[PDB]
Amino acid sequence: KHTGYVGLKNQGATCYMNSLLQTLFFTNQLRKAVYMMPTEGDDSSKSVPLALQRVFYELQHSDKPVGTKKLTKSFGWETLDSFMQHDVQELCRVLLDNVENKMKGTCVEGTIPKLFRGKMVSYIQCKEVDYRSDRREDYYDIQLSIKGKKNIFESFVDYVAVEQLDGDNKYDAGEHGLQEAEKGVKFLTLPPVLHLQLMRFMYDPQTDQNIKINDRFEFPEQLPLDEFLQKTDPKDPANYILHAVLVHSGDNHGGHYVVYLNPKGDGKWCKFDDDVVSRCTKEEAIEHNYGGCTNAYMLVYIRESKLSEVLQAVTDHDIPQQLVERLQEEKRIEAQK
Amino acid sequence: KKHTGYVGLKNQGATCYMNSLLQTLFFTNQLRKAVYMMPTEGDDSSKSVPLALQRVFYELQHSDKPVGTKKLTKSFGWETLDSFMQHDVQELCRVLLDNVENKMKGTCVEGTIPKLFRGKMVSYIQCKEVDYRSDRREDYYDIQLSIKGKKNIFESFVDYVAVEQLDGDNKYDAGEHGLQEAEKGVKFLTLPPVLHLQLMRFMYDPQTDQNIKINDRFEFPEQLPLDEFLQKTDPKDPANYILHAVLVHSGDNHGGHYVVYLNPKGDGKWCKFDDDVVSRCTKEEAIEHNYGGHCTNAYMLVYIRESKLSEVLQAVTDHDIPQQLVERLQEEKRIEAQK
Numbered sequence: 001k002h003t004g005y006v007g008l009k010n011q012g013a014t015c016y017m018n019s020l021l022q023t024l025f026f027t028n029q030l031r032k033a034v035y036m037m038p039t040e041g042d043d044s045s046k047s048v049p050l051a052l053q054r055v056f057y058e059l060q061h062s063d064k065p066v067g068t069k070k071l072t073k074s075f076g077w078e079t080l081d082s083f084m085q086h087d088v089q090e091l092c093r094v095l096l097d098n099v100e101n102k103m104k105g106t107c108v109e110g111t112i113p114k115l116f117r118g119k120m121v122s123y124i125q126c127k128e129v130d131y132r133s134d135r136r137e138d139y140y141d142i143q144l145s146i147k148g149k150k151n152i153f154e155s156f157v158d159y160v161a162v163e164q165l166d167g168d169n170k171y172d173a174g175e176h177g178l179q180e181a182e183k184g185v186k187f188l189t190l191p192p193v194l195h196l197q198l199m200r201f202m203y204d205p206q207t208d209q210n211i212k213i214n215d216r217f218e219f220p221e222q223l224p225l226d227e228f229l230q231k232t233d234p235k236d237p238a239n240y241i242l243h244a245v246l247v248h249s250g251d252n253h254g255g256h257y258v259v260y261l262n263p264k265g266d267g268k269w270c271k272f273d274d275d276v277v278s279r280c281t282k283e284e285a286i287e288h289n290y291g292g293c294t295n296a297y298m299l300v301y302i303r304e305s306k307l308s309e310v311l312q313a314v315t316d317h318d319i320p321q322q323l324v325e326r327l328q329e330e331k332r333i334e335a336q337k
Numbered sequence: 338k339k340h341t342g343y344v345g346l347k348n349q350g351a352t353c354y355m356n357s358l359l360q361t362l363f364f365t366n367q368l369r370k371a372v373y374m375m376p377t378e379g380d381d382s383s384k385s386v387p388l389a390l391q392r393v394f395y396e397l398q399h400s401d402k403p404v405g406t407k408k409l410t411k412s413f414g415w416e417t418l419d420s421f422m423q424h425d426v427q428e429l430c431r432v433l434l435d436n437v438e439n440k441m442k443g444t445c446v447e448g449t450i451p452k453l454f455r456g457k458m459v460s461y462i463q464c465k466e467v468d469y470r471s472d473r474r475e476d477y478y479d480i481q482l483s484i485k486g487k488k489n490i491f492e493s494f495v496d497y498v499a500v501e502q503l504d505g506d507n508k509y510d511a512g513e514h515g516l517q518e519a520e521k522g523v524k525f526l527t528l529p530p531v532l533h534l535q536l537m538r539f540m541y542d543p544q545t546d547q548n549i550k551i552n553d554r555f556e557f558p559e560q561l562p563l564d565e566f567l568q569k570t571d572p573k574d575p576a577n578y579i580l581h582a583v584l585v586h587s588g589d590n591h592g593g594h595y596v597v598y599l600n601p602k603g604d605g606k607w608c609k610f611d612d613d614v615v616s617r618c619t620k621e622e623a624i625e626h627n628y629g630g631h632c633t634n635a636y637m638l639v640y641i642r643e644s645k646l647s648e649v650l651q652a653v654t655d656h657d658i659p660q661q662l663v664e665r666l667q668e669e670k671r672i673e674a675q676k
């Protein structure tokens with residue numbers, strides 16, 4: 001806590017979890033809303049919302065590394081096997097789903113969509129007849145292809161690349177029969193907080209197993225994404241500011257998991273390595289995780305026009321006395337056990 | 338809401354200081370955001386002071402034309418000039434704040450108003466020749482500073498905490514000890530993040546048997562260190578305050594001119610709120626030119642604790658208004674627009 005920030009204990013093999021928790025904790029608007037959830041009546045053990053309020057409260061006050069056994073118990077991932085079976089965004093979704101449901105009907109309903117939800121359109125366009133099918137879709141995160149890609153830009157170019165449906169893969173166009181077509185997707189909106197996973201763990205059919213790609217993949221501290229919007233908005237361009245870099249060293253779940261953050265969004269970075277939080281250079285947080293077996297697998301961008309809102313001050317004023325009293329009693333009981 | 342980013346309040350009658358206070362409260366962003374959170378879905382559209390204040394704040398934050406207040410004054414019953422001539426500005430503030438504090442009880446944002454505005458003081462009487470003392474802890478949400486014969490805020494605070502001697506024909510009744518020489522005073526224990534200071538310019542004049550406005554020069558600073566006046570300081574959070582708003586009046590009665598000066602972001606970029614007209618102005622016009630000495634002078638100052646500034650003035654946006662609340666207000670503007 002010589003950085004103002006405290007770490008998370010190393011308790012069992014939980015791989016990416018501690019990295020994701022810091023990331024969410026420093027999404028201040030989220031953190032603040034999580035403190036507003038009415039959990040007074042929740043079972044102290046089965047409730048994921050309460051368990052997240054606890055960890056957040058501990059991260060905001062403890063000068064010692066913060067435990068997470070009650071959190072992993074709440075959603076039932078208590079074994080290394082659980083983490084080996086899910087991608088990081090799947091854990092993220094477990095966490096945000098629980099919290100978003102708990103806020104329905106309250107002061108703070110919709111917080112999760114407001115922060116993380118974006119809109120895109122998937123389409124199929126017939127080339128030789130007049131048939132088009134568009135499908136609007138919501139997304140809370142984006143999976144980016146990196147194999148053969150040098151940087152985030154090429155990755156977005158590829159994401160919106162037009163796929164050709166012909167030969168043996170013609171499109172069933174209904175009344176029109178088998179038809180040559182073009183398929184793709186377009187971004188309609190980007191959310192204030194942009195979760196990008198990098199698809200480094202890829203299936204190798206030879207071994208019938210997944211294999212981490214350690215290839216070099218570059219991402220910027222500043223990400224302009226206007227050129228990937230269907231329509232852009234002057235007075236609110238889609239310029240993004242790197243907030244977190246989730247990093248893995250090695251080739252398997254036995255590897256080393258850390259996250260880098262500039263929590264205030266000011267380019268002053270720290271490395272969160274379970275219980276050890278320490279200042280680092282910008283280069284170590286960014287370019288040194290480009291790869292080429294230490295590298296990033298998930299990046300969090302905040303939209304520049306949103307930075308001051310997503311990262312608003314969250315203080316002890318923001319914790320209902322009721323919550324604080326329950327968390328404090330619970331700690332006293334642990335200290336007694 | 339074109340030149341400045343901020344919109345005005347209509348001049349709808351003689352509401353005197355009310356528009357000035359509404360702007361002051363509206364730019365207490367932490368309060369605004371909590372006001373939006375209040376559960377007023379079931380409130381009477383016209384008798385609820387809380388709903389009425391969500392309405393004005395919502396209009397102040399979205400409307401491009403100056404904002405009306407008739408539903409608001411009707412909701413707490415101050416519909417004539419007489420209602421304003423009977424109350425000091427802080428009494429109006431307490432009516433608005435108490436209503437919203439009670440409406441927040443039992444909710445996510447219970448305690449917002451004390452958190453923001455409430456400080457702690459201790460008043461005492463101390464016998465000099467016998468071992469007897471009476472202490473009285475009190476909450477306070479605002480402070481009335483004496484200005485008559487005072488040059489600036491600092492001398493007013495010195496006077497506020499001065500020791501009064503009870504002697505001669507004014508000995509304290511010490512009960513079992515009989516009449517006793519004593520001194521009584523007040524000490525600050527804590528100062529709130531948002532400090533409301535009234536200046537006592539409207540003083541009773543013995544002769545005319547009447548209140549008369551005092552236009553004496555009285556200086557107040559952009560940066561206000563108050564640590565001296567605390568019983569116990571805290572090195573990790575000094576009691577340094579930043580000037581946020583200056584409520585001003587010219588003339589000698591309630592038919593005068595009421596204006597408020599703000600730097601809403603706390604960055605020293607000031608605007609003048611003259612009912613419907615909001616305009617950029619110099620720091621000098623907002624501060625030293627309201628010192629007094631025809632012209633407007635200050636009767637109320639709002640300071641914000643420097644350590645608390647980024648919290649009190651946190652961003653509040655349209656996504657801090659519940660969708661249920663927006664549709665109720667929008668459905669209302671549409672009925673108004675239909676006349």
Ligand SMILES: C[C@H](CC(=O)N1CCC(O)(Cn2cnc3cc(NC(=O)CCN4CCN(C)CC4)ccc3c2=O)CC1)c1ccccc1
Nearest residue numbers: 015016087088143197198199200201212248251252253297
């Ligand atoms: C060894 C550790 C394991 C680990 O700790 N993690 C956490 C990080 C981890 O989750 C990151 N990651 C990686 N590769 C992915 C591949 C996809 N693919 C798709 O989604 C398919 C897309 N298709 C949609 C359907 N369409 C019909 C066709 C297109 C998705 C997500 C990921 C993903 O989240 C991997 C596992 C390791 C590996 C590697 C790096 C860092 C640590």
Ligand SMILES: C[C@H](CC(=O)N1CCC(O)(Cn2cnc3cc(NC(=O)CCN4CCN(C)CC4)ccc3c2=O)CC1)c1ccccc1
Nearest residue numbers: 353354425426481535536537538539550586589590591636
């Ligand atoms: C003509 C207009 C009128 C007006 O529009 N206002 C609003 C602003 C207004 O309210 C500001 N204001 C607030 N509060 C006051 C409180 C006191 N004293 C106390 O209440 C403490 C009594 N204690 C003394 C010590 N004792 C041990 C215990 C009892 C005196 C004067 C003022 C005062 O002037 C005045 C009225 C006008 C006048 C003047 C200026 C600006 C406009």
